[PDB]
Subunit: 268 residues, 4 copies
């Protein structure tokens, strides 16, 4: 038993055991929830990884860009959980953006073909996923997607910041749409965690200039954060997503709950 | 056992069983926390009311405006809980403002002697209380005070809005101050609940004009709210304060967690 | 002479004499600025309309979605103004969204092909335009695009809100990009103005089901607005865009200046 | 010509040629605005200070913490300008707060007295000069006092950022109980210019701690602004205030006009 006792919670976005999505699943499982895991394309590969999760959770295939995947979604999920049973949650830990609009390549240069590829998988997909799953959700259910404070412009995040900013706005509209089924829609704003990707830029893969600009940024995050910030530990972020998936915040919708050590409230 | 199992949580602001503070205590108690209740002046009276709380919690006297009360605070509390034991939380459900700056009397007329009386008990007291108690708080502890979205100017709330706006800012500074002890500082923003006071204005005690301006406001709160808003039930607000008092949001500080049905994110 | 004396200011987005862009041009011209007008496709038609502008301003063709148009942009403009002379401003009054995005279309239905068509012309084009023109701008120059407060979710705007929200974020990044040339980037947030089919969004073609929606919106806007709101007059918005184009706000960048009667600051 | 050639304005708050006001005033006094100034506890001081200014304007011994003073804050200016000849501007730059809630003296090391005592000029104040000068004001005309971004918790500024979150909230209600007057009350928030308060809170009377902290935040703002920021001068910031008096920013209220240099909007 536990925080997520008896709840059937869906969790997408696991590609490795460093994924925030992997930690959300691990913690969600410990807390008692029953998971239905979805994976992009490396099905036999990420399968192996989902084997690390304390409990077995049926892996289903889901490319958010494909309406064939979306359509089948609710359907498979039902077979995944059972007939009669419905979903208590949906976790959208999906975020993409080709190097063209994120990082060392300039802001003005990133072409729309890529920007749009990020805005479709990062921002929009939240909607289409709320769209495909909402019907099979019990009232009182919760849908929570990841965010990264787009309020102020920062170097490198460039177009991925813009796609996240669009994400928050979408959150609000899905919120009233989810309202009709009793579901809540919320977004979590974490500080940088070191997934494969971040370890990459850190160690000069991007190079000197970049690896530093981001180093200091991660560095400063700890400066301002009152209870500090531990970028090599996602457990604080997993815990937060689980709380939002519980009966303890039954009134927050179209909202954003920050889990970045409060770094965003301090200036220095 | 439960959400607040084994935690010793302080809860001030109970004057009746309609007080949000009363609900925070009732739920906190059910969830397993051990309470230490503080009361303003009607000690023998509010005592009788705290008797309704599922469990007995030692009532201590606390007038936030009195430095004698503040100084003794930590002290008594220790006797209240025991030698060795420390506090896991502090709940500041205190808010005051003489009718001069709130309601039907105009904004320009409210004199500073009153405005200041509200700003001392509503805004500042959060600090002095964090001041008096912080020392006896275990790291990982949480301090949460009530708020009422001051972002946009609304009729009647007038100077009490201003004092709450000052409150949020104080929250941020106490946040970094609490950081050094491992405590988190957060503010909850609820929509209108009907305590004694609100039932009063509603039923024309203030009169026609006022009783209506507030009626429609409470009315519209439900309009915009996606999962609606039940002003005759504080259970949703109590639940939220308890979650903030738990291990499930270990990274939010100097923050504000809205519990108003998300009415604040929608325009219509 | 006047507010925009001697300044060569570009103004895009004029399709009729109801366009806010038309008013920005009329006032800009009165104030002394020299205009370089751009039109989408109805070149012979909107040409006829630009003839109403107090003074003649060379019409150039510009489809923002076409990199051929963009590339040629700086070039033509130079021939339009002269050799040696540079631009002092750029006004991006461009905004698009097919009825499946906005409309009364259930938000979940709007497919990405359209959403993306709006996000390319509304949000992104701001960038590519700042991209194409920045080079020929004098330091101290100003680029200002239109906005419509996306902070809170409102009915009908749906995906166009999302595109506008993306727009503000882009503004911030163009802001630091423009910084290097001395140019400022800012967005103006107006309340509803009535433009010919926008009179078919209320008491015309689009106000029968969720059509009164833009009534109580067009209505409520005046309620909350302290100095009121006159939706049948764009002069207040034109005046604001000209001030931003002047030497009187030399330090605001990546910012948003609201021109909706302050309706956005009041709750009721 | 001028923005203000012909506009009648009271500019409140001159102590030095180096403090904000002496700036707004020469700039305002040069733009055709005929002004009437206010001074504090050494008017014999602000007197010969003022000769340094561009033309003549009388000095009224005020102090918005004195009520016989507030009492007469209309029919003394009405005596100062014309025999029933009206007034256009209220450029409030009245603000102050004692060194215990300052930086040097720690957040918790201070009491109410002093905070309450500073708000009176800092926060509350704007909600004073308002009522007084109001029915002696002409439509159009504005009420505008300085703001220093309260949003993030600026350590070292402490209570005079909290008072700042409060000046703001109070300027929004004056945005309504003035909007009937067709008057504007709008806040111009700007960055830490080197004035006698700051120029001295470094060179000698505070030794360090708030100091390193302040220079800590000055290297910042500069390094963080797209169009950059200088602090050895206030002129672009003084200008941004002016057009906020003119007819060029016509549709805003209970608003914040930012001339900080785009520093409030840049993460890194
Ligand atoms: N790591 C950080 O610093 C950090 C911090 C806060 C928030 N975030 C955000 O959280 C999200 C997850 O990133 P992460 O680093 O925690 O984990 P991750 O990158 O390991 O997980 C992201 C997932 O995106 C998915 N994806 C991409 N395109 C897809 C598509 N077409 N269809 C279906 N799935 C697709 C992949 O399956 C992948 O598992 C992103 O939105 C990211 O911006 C990251
Ligand atoms: N009721 C609502 O509509 C509503 C909604 C959201 C937030 N709030 C806020 O929550 C807080 C509590 O109000 P409520 O209606 O839930 O309950 P309440 O009014 O019943 O409780 C408020 C408490 O203020 C305390 N108090 C006043 N001065 C004091 C002082 N000098 N020293 C010590 N204690 C003092 C009293 O002891 C009283 O118990 C206020 O800040 C209020 O603005 C109210
Ligand atoms: N009317 C209102 O209620 C209102 C209020 C505030 C802000 N706004 C915003 O201001 C902008 C202008 O709308 P409006 O009603 O004032 O005027 P409008 O609709 O008359 O002008 C908009 C322009 O969009 C242009 N456009 C579309 N696609 C283009 C493309 N592919 N390439 C180049 N140009 C293209 C057209 O040329 C057209 O002139 C929009 O962003 C709108 O959302 C509208
Ligand atoms: N310099 C900075 O750090 C900076 C920069 C931007 C914004 N802010 C804010 O800008 C505003 C302008 O400050 P300045 O830097 O020109 O300061 P200054 O102190 O040199 O001049 C402004 C005035 O503060 C006044 N003041 C104190 N009590 C007052 C009272 N009771 N009556 C009348 N005036 C009162 C004095 O009369 C003094 O003349 C302040 O409110 C400041 O908080 C500060
Ligand atoms: C190769 C990764 C690109 C480098 C990181 C992008 C620029 C970093 C600066 C902004 C910091 C923002 C924190 C966000 C980090 C991310 O979104 S990681 C990308 C998500 N998933 C992967 C592995 O691609
Ligand atoms: C007698 C109460 C005064 C009337 C209510 C104030 C004006 C209501 C309009 C704004 C609505 C805001 C909701 C907030 C309500 C409160 O803070 S109730 C006062 C707190 N405690 C008491 C009983 O005095």
């Amino acid at each position: 038993t536990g925080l997520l006792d008896g709840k059937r919670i869906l969790v997408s976005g696991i590609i490795t055991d460093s994924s925030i999505a992997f930690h959300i699943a691990r913690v969600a499982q410990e807390q008692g929830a029953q998971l239905v895991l979805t994976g992009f394309d490396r099905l036999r590969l990420i399968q192996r990884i989902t084997d690390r999760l304390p409990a077995k959770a049926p892996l289903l295939e889901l490319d958010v860009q494909n309406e064939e995947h979306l359509a089948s979604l609710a359907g498979r999920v039902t077979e995944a959980i059972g007939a009669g049973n419905k979903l208590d949650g949906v976790v959208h830990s999906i975020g993409f953006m080709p190097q063209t609009g994120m990082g060392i390549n300039p802001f003005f240069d990133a072409p729309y073909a890529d920007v749009s590829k990020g805005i479709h998988i990062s921002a929009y997909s939240y909607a289409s996923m709320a769209k495909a799953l909402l019907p099979i959700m019990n009232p009182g259910g919760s849908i929570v997607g990841m965010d990264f404070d787009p309020s102020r412009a920062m170097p490198a995040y460039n177009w991925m910041t813009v796609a996240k900013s669009a994400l928050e706005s979408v959150n609000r509209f899905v919120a009233r749409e989810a309202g009709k089924y009793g579901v809540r829609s919320n977004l979590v704003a974490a500080g940088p965690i070191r997934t494969l990707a971040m370890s990459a830029i850190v160690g000069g893969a991007l190079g000197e200039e970049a690896g530093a600009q981001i180093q200091l940024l991660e560095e400063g995050w700890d400066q301002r954060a009152p209870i500090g910030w531990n970028m090599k530990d996602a457990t604080p972020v997993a815990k937060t997503v689980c709380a939002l998936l519980s009966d303890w915040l039954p009134a927050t919708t179209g909202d954003i709950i920050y889990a970045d050590g409060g770094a965003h409230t301090q200036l220095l």
